[PDB]
Amino acid sequence: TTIMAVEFDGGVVVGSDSRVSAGEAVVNRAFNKLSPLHQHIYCALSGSAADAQAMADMAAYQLELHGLELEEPPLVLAAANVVRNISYKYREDLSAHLMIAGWDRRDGGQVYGTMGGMLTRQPFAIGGSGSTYIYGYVDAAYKPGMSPEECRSFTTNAIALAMNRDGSSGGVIHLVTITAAGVDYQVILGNELPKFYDE
Amino acid sequence: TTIMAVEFDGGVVVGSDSRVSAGEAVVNRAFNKLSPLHQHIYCALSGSAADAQAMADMAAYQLELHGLELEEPPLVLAAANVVRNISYKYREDLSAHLMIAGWDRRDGGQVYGTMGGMLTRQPFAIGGSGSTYIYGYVDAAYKPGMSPEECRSFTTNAIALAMNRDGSSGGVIHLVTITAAGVDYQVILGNELPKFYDE
Amino acid sequence: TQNPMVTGTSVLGVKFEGGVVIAADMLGSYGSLARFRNISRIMRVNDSTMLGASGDYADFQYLKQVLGQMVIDEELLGDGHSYSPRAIHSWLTRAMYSRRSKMNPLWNTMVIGGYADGESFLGYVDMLGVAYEAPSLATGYGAYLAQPLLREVLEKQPVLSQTEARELVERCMRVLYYRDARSYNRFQIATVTEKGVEIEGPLSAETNWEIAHM
Amino acid sequence: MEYLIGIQGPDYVLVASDQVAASSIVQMKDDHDKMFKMSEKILLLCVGEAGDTVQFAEYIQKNVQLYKMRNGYELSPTAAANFTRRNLADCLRSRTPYHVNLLLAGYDEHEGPALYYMDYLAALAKAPFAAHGYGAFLTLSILDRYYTPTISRERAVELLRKCLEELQKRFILNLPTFSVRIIDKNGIHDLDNISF
Amino acid sequence: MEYLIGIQGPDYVLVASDQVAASSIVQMKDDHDKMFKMSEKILLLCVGEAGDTVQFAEYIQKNVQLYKMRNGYELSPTAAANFTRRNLADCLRSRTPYHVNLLLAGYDEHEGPALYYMDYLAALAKAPFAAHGYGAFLTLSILDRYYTPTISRERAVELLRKCLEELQKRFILNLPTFSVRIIDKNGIHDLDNISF
Amino acid sequence: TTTLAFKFQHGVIVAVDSRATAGNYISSSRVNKVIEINPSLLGTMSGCAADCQYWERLLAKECRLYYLRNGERISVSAASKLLSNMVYQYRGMDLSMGSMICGWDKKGPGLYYVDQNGTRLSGNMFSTGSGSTYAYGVMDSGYQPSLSPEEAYELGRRAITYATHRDSYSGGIINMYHMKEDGWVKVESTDVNELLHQYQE
Amino acid sequence: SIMSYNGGAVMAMKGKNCVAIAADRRFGIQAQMVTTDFQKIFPMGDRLYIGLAGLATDVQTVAQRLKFRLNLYELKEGRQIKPYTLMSMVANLLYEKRFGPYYTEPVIAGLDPKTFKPFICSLDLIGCPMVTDDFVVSGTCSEQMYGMCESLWEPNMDPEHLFETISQAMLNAVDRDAVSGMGVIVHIIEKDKITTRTLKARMD
Amino acid sequence: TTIAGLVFRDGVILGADTRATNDSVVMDKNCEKIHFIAPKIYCCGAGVAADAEMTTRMAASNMELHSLSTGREPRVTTVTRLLRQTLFRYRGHVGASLLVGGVDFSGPQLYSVHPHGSYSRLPFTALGSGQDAALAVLEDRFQPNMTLEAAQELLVEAITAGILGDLGSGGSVDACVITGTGAKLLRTLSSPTKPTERPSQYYFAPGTTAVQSQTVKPL
Amino acid sequence: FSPYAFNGGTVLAIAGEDFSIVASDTRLSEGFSIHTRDSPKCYKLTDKTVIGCSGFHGDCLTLTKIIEARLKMYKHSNNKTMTTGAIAAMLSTILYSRRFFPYYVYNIIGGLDEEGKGAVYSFDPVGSYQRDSFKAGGSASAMLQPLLDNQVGFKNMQNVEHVPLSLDRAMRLVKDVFISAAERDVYTGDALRICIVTKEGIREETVPLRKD
Ligand SMILES: *[B]([O])([O])[C]([C][C]([C])[C])[N]C(=O)C1=[C]N([C]2[C][C][C][C][C]2)N=N1
Ligand SMILES: *[B]([O])([O])[C]([C][C]([C])[C])[N]C(=O)C1=[C]N([C]2[C][C][C][C][C]2)N=N1
Ligand SMILES: *[B]([O])([O])[C]([C][C]([C])[C])[N]C(=O)C1=[C]N([C]2[C][C][C][C][C]2)N=N1
């Protein structure tokens, strides 16, 4: 599994691979790891599919209620805190890292890593088994002031490099761009992925 | 430990980090992991320091004798085969990957990975604990037809990216360029290493 | 917490004439991988107390949340009483011991610095509930690398000035960077005096690699 | 290991047991009684893990006695045997199970003499004769060879002697004396100890 | 567990041992001899792991006999005891060690009566009296209480009887008969068996 | 540890050694291994010192409460049953206690053995502890029910002394008591080294 | 542990122109005592003794193999071995069994054959020497022995004072040890005579 | 144990503490840890004490044979090759951790050699349980080409840090100064600790100790 | 994860005719490093009782706080200060309440009894205890106890007068055994703290020990 989220001036770009694995067998080659928690808030799932799905649903429920009580769209930090709380409380039982990304009127585009109950705000985050192979790549390629188009391109490249090297990653690349205007979904199929040194 | 070797038209560029570690303690922060097996043949060491040192010495001895018997400079493939033989025979006892790179009059600049007794010729090779973080980086940055200067720059960048992320890597960057003309050594100190996204 | 994920390394601390200074790097380690290179491991508790923590970062964030609320709660009363460094050190000790007794420890080693009523305070609290005070402190790998240097300077000059303590701390940070594999050359320095708690950062130590040529 | 044995005749039940109480390699007591009187016509022979036997047997004894106090008549051997099994089986999957082996001998007014065998897992079985412990391996075949359903009490005592003599010659443990009791229509009678 | 015992008097050595050969819970043999005659004045009492005792004792016996054939005189008890220890200790760290416990009793022309105690790790110790096995725990104190260095052979036999009687009453194992032998200047003499 | 007790024609004798150890280190040579519950009741201790000290003191509390409630003084048989039921609740939890309860009630001299597994036995003579097998040998060899008081004291002293000579975990001094109809009397407190040297000569 | 299976304690003390070596006499298997006159100190020359503590079987084996080697040495060299040379001989013997060691820690005490200078040392089970100027201890109650020796030992003690010192050191040390004791034997080695004394000790 | 070495302008300085412990008890208060290999080559040993002793003795012996046959002064590199080839053969079972220092024809050389057989040539090193403390002093104050007295003070401060900070180290500091000209073995170069003076005392008279038997044998 | 740690330290107590001494070293350790050289292990409970603790410092800090609260609670419900012997009896039950997850602490109490004589009580971690004349506890306890048996108990000496122990002699002996213990035990060192309990109160004295 490889997930990544980048902050840009006015929103966020979040993407991931589509592979679900059970040992050496591919149980689902087109799974969507990008899940919406609210209108402008998304979360990327990595680790255990059952734990992540359960956590995401619990959070979506808590945030929905919270939003109707406060009569306003929930902040990205609130969504991250709710996820952090659940992740920290059940750290012994849960094996899933729910990366949070979204947009709100107070702080704009925000990316939060909440692995293991620890909450950290970053300009860009990478997770999953395949993220280890692209650390060098993102550290040398990332530049401040990137536009949404550049962010989408940056994310696609990194994910493609990880999918080629990581056995647990592969399939297609799911991409979502969140801004004030809304959510834009995008799917880069196997034959349209960026190509690099392969032989 | 992070080691890397690149083939270029007319020779090879081999480099590595200088960290020797024992758990969390740095036992030697300026160790030279690049060892000459012959006049134009080098090997990069990764894994156990004792095993690699013993293997390198055994091979250097065998190649020296071989060279005096055949009355000519040993081929790079012969050096790789000798290393492969020792590495395969003692696979159960040895925990060290001796990457081979050099120049000979028959095949020019050659890079051989001989981890675990398996011999493979590649245009560029990376090894050690820190190499996992730069797979994405080298796959996207490597281009055929690079010059020695570009190869030296490519190697320095990759090693620097790995040293920053990998706890087992660090210190200085040792670099050797081998051609028909000879061996050129170079040391990039801590304050002269390439800088990328760090915060 | 039996399995710590993201951890921080050494935390240094030394008393000086009219204050306490503590240092910690900004690295969040995931095993041997340097995963989070910009996280603060030093927290201001109140006007006279600061806290540095090594070990599990998530446990430190939780402790920071609980401690932070306690201070806010106390300030709401506005009765003229506030938690002294000693009282916070005592509270932390009980908290750690309690968690350890239920076999669910908070995987952290802490350094508490403070200045109250013209007296500097420096306390240590580990995950087992072991607590004590000393003129200088160093958690984790610093105990073997930094403490020896700190103690050596205090054996010749027990009372240090703010400038001396600051320079001594920077020398220790450099050694840690040279010899600790889980360390990073980006740190913070927190100081507590009569004027309150100040946190300088990010800072870097000057490194020499002359020996590589040798 | 302790030894228990029961032989059921046409109108009586004969039981016997060793009187050794041991602690590791030393015999701490050589005249220990392993029989518990539950009622006028019911005997409970119990062996096994130290502590458990007495705790369990006494618990049953108190409940059997309480039944008689509340109703005016005694529980029958069959009902008592099932009550014992029920209780033993209930503690089987609990935190505090009872590691005991037992024999329940009794005489019912309407049903006659009864002998019940129960292992530690609470399996209950009615039998003409039975034995518990390591000694049962050396004596069960002897009972199989000489026992008849119409055996008289005099022949039963001789048959019991045969079994006990076998233990003296073949068994590695030192069991020099045995408690011998008989239950019939006139109640529980103490016979002479069989000693070697 | 087997039982061995030796009592050394002013001019004789008295030894005794149980005659039980066991297989799990059954006594397969009730008149098994645990004593091996190495020479005219030397007895080797051996107990322990099945197979080992006989293999080891016979090996020593054959070597002690060979010494006499080659030289014309017998090895002394002391030399024999040390020869036995040497051999036992040599196999201690080998692949095939001998798990045996023994007592070496003998009478030397110049030195007189001797009693040697040897454990399975090959530690050798000379002693006025000694015992091996679980029974030694119940009888060693009895020897400590009544033994004197000038005890006569008649009193020694009574002292041995006291020890064996204690086993009958306190020990959990069934050991009804013992082999009793005495070694003095006239050689090895067989005394009457002490049975219960 | 070696403790012993036996009934004879003049009551009950109770004797113990006084050694406590931790591994091979002798932590004390002056431990009191006899608890005086009341003037007609004694308890001996063997096994873990904290378990024995605590549960036997708890029995003493229960015995005293029984006396205030009933106005009658608990019998030896009921005291031992109370102790055996107390420790039976913690069975399997690694308690270590081997006790002898001895006294004189309405049914005459009583002697019971109670241990951590719940074993409770009434008897004429008992020995407990790591040196108990040695004590049994000497005690059973010289025991007669018609012993005179001085002869019984001598047998008790010899049985403890020889056990301390052979058992590494026993030693120090021997504390002996004599249980009678009117209550127990502390007979003596002799160092076992003085005793063994006087028997050696 | 294998080193506490039989128990035992040995100590050597240096005096003024003399040496003392002492040991307990108990031979026992675990908690049970077997004999009270087991030999742990063996003569290895006129003024040279070796004390062995640890597994009884190895104590006898090491002493016997060492005697074998020393005897051959004396015949070949035609002289009495020096205290220091014996230490090396013993270390070599114990090191040969580096992987499958003899469970014993020897203590050497003696005076040089020509200058009569006191010498003491102690080796471990692997064969590492510890030559000291005051005392050396070995056995199950080493901690107790260290305590007694550290506070009682004085430099330049004469034979009488040295005897009292080592005697008190051993007596009080073995009394706090369960598997050590049953008597104490002491050897006072002087230039002109050897004095052997058995002390009055506890037998429990 | 704290052992340390540094290369200075004209040679090598080796250092060690003198405490030998059995688990948590001090067995020897004056163990010599700096051993002679050859006239101009010394070795400091840490790790398993019997292994260090045997390993250095075997090496010194082989190095003496070598120098008798060649007729020349032994090289530090030969000592490192003999030691490391022996240690690799035993696969770490011979637990010898060493610091090898010496001066030969090619100048001063310092090596650290570890139990499995790996080695490193460096300008300063430390080993033993007090190694981190000594290394902190070297990292903080080492400079290349120091004078003999500055190097002696630096090595003493590094050993002293281990002596005061590590419970496995103590006693005195010993030093070995090796140059082209000479070898200076300074057993007891600094004595930073000492037993206290002692207030009262104890005294045993004549026959305080009760005696059972006595034999005198005259020589 | 292990809930304990060995933090070293030695405690001694000696009872005299009208005094008791409790002494201890001040080194706190963990593994092979020293946490601090100024951590005394003896706390005052009342004006005639001092407790010395050694073992796992986490349990030592918590147990002392618990005892301090129980003394206040006892005073509130009994209207008087707890005596030395009631403190010893009460500590036994507190240690036995954690019989299945014990406090890893070796305690020694030193004080005066009701007749104004020295009293010493020694405890094992699960609560077993007894009154003694003197006692050593902690890391160097097996080095010190044999010497106290000989020099205070007069064991193994013949033709020796068993004179009563004076404060002066007791003080020199306490300093000497700790000096000997600092030479051999690696966990004992830095400084010696001696508390003397008499009817006039508790006086303290500090003496330096080897720092290595
Ligand atoms: B990824 O590899 O981390 C991926 C991310 C998930 C979808 C959030 N996880 C998995 O591949 C994965 C597979 N499984 C189960 C394996 C056994 C069968 C059911 C699915 N759990 N996580
Ligand atoms: B690298 O990290 O892989 C590095 C490469 C080596 C030098 C060829 N290896 C090590 O870091 C290393 C350290 N050690 C030993 C650890 C114990 C002390 C001696 C050195 N072995 N390999
Ligand atoms: B005896 O040896 O049984 C004796 C009886 C007691 C004092 C009533 N017991 C002890 O010596 C003893 C030993 N221990 C613990 C054993 C494990 C280590 C700590 C001490 N408790 N009592």
**B21 C-alpha to center of ligand 2: Å?**
5
Measure CB to CB from residue I3 to each of C103, C133, C134 and give the nearest one: C103
CA E92 remoteness from chain centre: 21
Give the gyration radius of chain I's Cα atoms: 17
Which residues is A96 bridged to in the sheet?
A47
- Is I5 in Cβ contact with C103 (below 8 Å)? no
Burial class (CB in 10 A: 0-12, 13-18, 19+), A26: middle
Q: Describe the crossing of helices C85-101 and C57-77 by its angle, rounded to 10 degrees.
A: 130
Judging contacts by C-beta atoms under 8 Å, the chain G residues touching residue F30 are none
**Which stretch of DSSP H or E encloses residue E44?**
strand E42-48
- If interface means Cβ-Cβ distance under 8 Å, which residues of chain F face chain E? 133-138, 140-141, 158-159, 162-163, 165-166
Closest CA to I87 of I108, I57, I104, I101: I108
- Is G175 in Cβ contact with I147 (below 8 Å)? no
Judging contacts by C-beta atoms under 8 Å, the chain B residues touching residue H139 are none
Question: Rounded to whole angstroms, how far apart are CA atoms I10 and I144?
Answer: 9
Task: List active site positions of A.
Answer: 1
Indicate which residue's Cα is closest to atom 16 of ligand 3.
Answer: F22
What are the tokens at B47?
């894994």
Question: What letters, b where the CB count within 10 A reaches 16 and e where it falls short, cover E3-33?
Answer: bbbbbbbeebbbbbbbbbebeeeebeebeee
Closest chain D C-alpha to F76 CA, distance in angstroms: 18
* φ and ψ of I200, to 5 deg: -80, -5
Question: Rounded to whole angstroms, how far apart are CA atoms B106 and B92?
Answer: 34
CA dihedral E1, E3, E4, E7 (to 10 degrees): 150
Chains H and B in direct contact, meaning 3 or more beta-carbon pairs closer than 8 angstroms: yes
- Is H27 in Cβ contact with G193 (below 8 Å)? no
Question: Rounded to whole angstroms, how far apart are CA atoms D101 and D2?
Answer: 10
Contacts of H158 (CB under 8 A, 6+ apart): H2, H4, H15, H126, H133, H134, H135, H137, H138
Question: Rounded to whole angstroms, how far apart are CA atoms H91 and H84?
Answer: 11
Chains D and F in direct contact, meaning 3 or more beta-carbon pairs closer than 8 angstroms: yes
Q: Describe the crossing of helices G142-152 and G159-174 by its angle, rounded to 10 degrees.
A: 150
- Is I181 in Cβ contact with G172 (below 8 Å)? no
Question: Rounded to whole angstroms, how far apart are CA atoms F144 and A192?
Answer: 104
Mutating to test ligand 1, I would choose from A14, A48, A169 the residue with most ligand atoms within 8 A of its C-beta, which is: A48
Mutating to test ligand 2, I would choose from B4, B17, B21, B159 the residue with most ligand atoms within 8 A of its C-beta, which is: B21
Which residues is A36 bridged to in the sheet?
A42
Indicate which residue's Cα is closest to atom 19 of ligand 3.
Answer: F22
Closest chain F C-alpha to G35 CA, distance in angstroms: 9
Q: Which atom of ligand 2 is nearest to the CA of B168?
A: 2
Q: Are H94 and H86 in contact (CB under 8 A)?
A: yes
D157 three-state secondary structure = helix
Closest chain C C-alpha to I199 CA, distance in angstroms: 32
Listed in order, strand segments (DSSP E) in chain D are 4-8, 13-18, 21-23, 26-29, 35-39, 42-48, 100-108, 112-118, 124-126, 129-132, 177-184, 187-190, 194-195
What are the tokens at F4?
């012993």
Q: Give the type of residue at B10.
A: G
Question: Rounded to whole angstroms, how far apart are CA atoms B12 and D149?
Answer: 101
Closest CA to D10 of D193, D119, D154, D132: D154
Question: Rounded to whole angstroms, how far apart are CA atoms I6 and D161?
Answer: 64
Contacts of H142 (CB under 8 A, 6+ apart): H6, H123, H124, H154
**D18 C-alpha to center of ligand 2: Å?**
70
∠C197-C198-C202 over CA atoms, to 5°?
Answer: 145
Contacts of C185 (CB under 8 A, 6+ apart): C25, C177, C204, C205, C207
Question: Rounded to whole angstroms, how far apart are CA atoms A192 and A196?
Answer: 12
Judging contacts by C-beta atoms under 8 Å, the chain H residues touching residue I160 are 208
Question: Rounded to whole angstroms, how far apart are CA atoms A190 and A193?
Answer: 6
Question: Rounded to whole angstroms, how far apart are CA atoms D123 and I197?
Answer: 69
Question: Rounded to whole angstroms, how far apart are CA atoms E18 and E168?
Answer: 12
Question: Ligand 2: residues whose CB is within 6 Å?
Answer: B 1, 20-22, 27, 31, 33, 45-49, 52, 128-129, 168; H 114, 118
Closest chain F C-alpha to E21 CA, distance in angstroms: 25
Is G179 near chain F, with CB under 8 Å?
Answer: yes
Question: Rounded to whole angstroms, how far apart are CA atoms A91 and I137?
Answer: 42
- What residue in E sits closest to G31 (Cα-Cα)? E137
Question: What letters, b where the CB count within 10 A reaches 16 and e where it falls short, cover C82-110?
Answer: ebbbbebbbbbbebbbebbbeeebbbbbb
Burial class (CB in 10 A: 0-12, 13-18, 19+), E195: exposed
- Mutation to test the I interface, candidates H24, H159, H197, H203, most I Cβ within 10 Å: H24
Experimental resolution (Å)? 2.0
Question: Rounded to whole angstroms, how far apart are CA atoms A96 and A89?
Answer: 13
Contacts of A23 (CB under 8 A, 6+ apart): none
Please state how this structure was obtained.
Answer: cryo-EM
Helix/strand/coil (H, E, C) string of C84-152? CHHHHHHHHHHHHHHHHHCCCCCCEEEEEEEEECCEEEEEEECCCCCEEECCEEECCCHHHHCHHHHHH
What are the tokens at H120?
């490193």
CA dihedral A56, A60, A63, A68 (to 10 degrees): 180
Looking up tokens 């200047």 gives E185
Question: What letters, b where the CB count within 10 A reaches 16 and e where it falls short, cover G164-185?
Answer: bbbbbbbbbbbbbbbbbbbbbb
Q: Are H195 and I146 in contact (CB under 8 A)?
A: no
Q: Give the type of residue at D15.
A: V
Give the gyration radius of chain D's Cα atoms: 16
Q: Give the type of residue at I202.
A: I
